Design a protein around this ligand. Structure first.
Ligand SMILES: *[C@@H]1O[C@H](CO)[C@@H](O)[C@H](O)[C@H]1NC(C)=O
Ligand SMILES: *[C@@H]1O[C@H](CO)[C@@H](O)[C@H](O)[C@H]1NC(C)=O
Ligand SMILES: [Zn+2]
Length: 597
């Protein structure tokens, strides 16, 4: 049994190596398909996934040869337990193949959406990225906005209802084969905490009043721009006016809702273009931020194999930005259809945070080469982006000029940041609240579409521009819903990234709550080896320990907390509460009239 444990340790070392080797090729096939959507690439991706699922079944069976619950090493026991968890690979081979086909159909559908131009309906080659996203972000023609909203949701959402239904069924079947009640419990398993969902309810409830104030002010300002017939005083905000196809962040309309329109609003896109920025330069700058913190420089494979601008050959691909670990040493890549904008610069850092994480844990055994939890993975790059976005940093790198950081400019900047960070929280929560409700069998198929919009109303106080019904199916028009990517990770990320940022800022000498010269919202951790060390300590652990141990390695904390994010926006909360009372701004909303059961 001491002998058996020694044998089990060698068995796991070899198994992890083999899993990394096989997953490398699965990842190559997935990369090929995602960068070039073809029936041939789809078939190879799905065959290799099927072969790997069959291997995982064998692995799970082989683990029963070892009396691993009697072993001394908690590490070995953790590895064995992770290797017993089959997920979708628990499905019978025919069901697994059908699930893969279903997922590919939805992903292909999303990637291939083309719409007709509003001004000339004979031009029908407008894609989400970049053409439709450009219109939704920049047009202030409410009819044009509503047209693109409808065309996109009809094609990206409604077209895949039947595939989505079958996916829900197979996801549920898989979950029950793994002894989870549903796919909701399967997803929640990744956080290794039986109170995790309630913890999020509690944090969300604390931040919700600030969201209500932001919502009310934005509606007030939208109504002043568009008039009562377009934006009602008391109803949910028509979502097509919020600058984003899913209304998940509202910073693209900052020029119609900024607190002080006479005072500066940071948008460095023009200066980036004036200075001849390219996607390459943007990625080089991100790399430089990480190396400035004494973290790992991007390896040669990254530069040689990444795709950092949209192809011009007219093939179909998934343009949704992503970061890829190929499970060797130093083979890590990003695929991004990069444009030279402030928003895209943040996305670059977001994706490079994933890459940094891959590099930091690449010597862990294969089973531990992943995030402490899914939210940790999403948070890394956003911590850097918070620094990148500060007037302090943008002035230093020459992208922001003639900027006086007076009280009004500060409110503009905090408000802009809140349009990205606070507004996203109810959005992110609803993406999984909706799917969990379907996974759990709590909504009859007859009510699936209005269940989606009811949640979007309840939590975000937004609604479609036009009346929808159960003849539409709108949820899959969000990438992650069509792609079967869990979304709670982003809610978790948006909370914990402020915990990481606050701690890194203190370690860098960039934040002191008692010093007016060092406010949290102007902290730049660029150049801080001390902040980098904290990242190294956490990120190098991968998934070797439960996430509270990874957090503790960073800053001694073990608890997920909304204190930091509230602290960041406290100056905005004070101003905004006073401003809404001053202007008699209506808070809250009536139930939406936009979904017919
Ligand atoms: C796209 O993939 C197909 C194989 O499915 C291939 O014939 C074609 O050359 C590929 N294009 C690129 C740019 O890789
Ligand atoms: C920087 O990182 C290297 C590599 O991890 C480490 O050995 C060294 O201690 C760090 N240097 C500083 C100044 O923190
Ligand atoms: Zn991400």
């Amino acid at each position: 049994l001491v002998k058996e444990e020694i044998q089990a340790k060698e068995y796991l070392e070899n198994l992890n190596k083999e899993l990394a080797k096989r997953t490398n090729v699965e990842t190559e096939a997935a990369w090929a398909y995602g960068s070039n959507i073809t029936d041939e690439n789809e078939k190879k991706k799905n065959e290799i996934s099927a072969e790997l699922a069959k291997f995982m079944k064998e692995v799970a069976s082989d683990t029963t040869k070892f009396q691993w619950r009697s072993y001394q090493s908690e590490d070995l026991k953790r590895q064995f337990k992770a290797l017993t968890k089959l997920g979708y690979a628990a499905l019978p081979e025919d069901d697994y193949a059908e699930l893969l086909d279903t997922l590919s159909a939805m992903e292909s559908n999303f990637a291939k959406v083309k719409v007709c131009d509003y001004k000339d309906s004979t031009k029908c080659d407008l894609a989400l990225d970049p053409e439709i996203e450009e219109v939704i972000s920049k047009s202030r023609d409410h009819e044009e906005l509503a047209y693109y909203w409808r065309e996109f949701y009809d094609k990206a959402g409604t077209a895949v209802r039947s595939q989505f239904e079958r996916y829900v069924e197979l996801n549920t079947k898989a979950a029950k084969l793994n002894n989870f009640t549903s796919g909701a419990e399967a997803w929640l398993d990744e956080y290794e905490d039986d109170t995790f969902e309630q913890q999020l309810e509690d944090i969300f409830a604390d931040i919700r009043p600030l969201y209500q104030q932001i919502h009310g002010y934005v509606r007030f300002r939208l109504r002043k721009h568009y008039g009562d017939a377009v934006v009602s005083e008391t109803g949910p905000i028509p979502m097509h006016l919020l600058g984003n196809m899913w209304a998940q962040q509202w910073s693209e309309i900052a020029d119609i809702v900024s607190p002080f329109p006479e005072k500066p609003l940071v948008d460095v896109s023009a200066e980036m273009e004036k200075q001849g920025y390219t996607p390459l330069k943007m990625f080089q700058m991100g790399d430089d931020f990480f190396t400035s913190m004494n973290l790992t420089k991007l390896p040669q494979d990254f530069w040689d194999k990444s795709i950092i601008e949209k192809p011009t050959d007219g093939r179909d691909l998934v343009c949704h930005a992503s970061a890829w670990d190929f499970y060797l040493t130093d083979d890590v890549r990003i695929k991004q259809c990069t444009r030279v904008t402030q928003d895209q610069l943040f996305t670059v850092h977001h994706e490079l945070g994933h890459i940094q994480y891959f590099l930091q844990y690449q010597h862990q055994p294969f089973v531990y080469r992943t995030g402490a939890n899914p939210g940790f993975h999403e948070a890394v790059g956003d911590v850097l982006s918070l620094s990148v976005s500060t007037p302090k940093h943008l002035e230093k790198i020459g992208l922001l000029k003639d900027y006086v950081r007076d009280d009004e400019a500060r409110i503009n900047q905090l408000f802009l940041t809140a349009l990205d960070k606070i507004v996203f929280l109810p959005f992110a929560f609803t993406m999984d609240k909706y799917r969990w409700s379907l996974f759990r069998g709590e909504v009859d198929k007859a009510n699936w579409n209005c269940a989606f919009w009811k949640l979007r109303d309840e939590y975000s106080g937004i609604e479609p521009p036009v009346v929808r019904s159960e003849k539409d199916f709108d949820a899959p028009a969000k990438y992650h819903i069509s792609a079967d990517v869990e979304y709670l990770r982003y809610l978790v990320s948006f909370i914990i990234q402020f915990q990481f940022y606050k701690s890194a800022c203190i370690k860098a000498g960039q934040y002191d709550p008692d010093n007016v010269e060092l406010p949290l919202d102007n902290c730049d951790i660029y150049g801080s080896a001390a902040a980098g060390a904290a990242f190294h300590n956490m990120l190098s652990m991968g998934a070797s320990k439960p996430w509270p141990d990874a957090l503790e390695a960073f800053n001694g904390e073990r608890i997920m907390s909304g204190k930091a994010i509230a602290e960041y926006f406290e100056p905005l909360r004070v101003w905004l509460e006073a401003e809404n009372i001053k202007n008699n701004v209506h808070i809250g909303w009536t139930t939406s009239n936009k979904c017919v059961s």
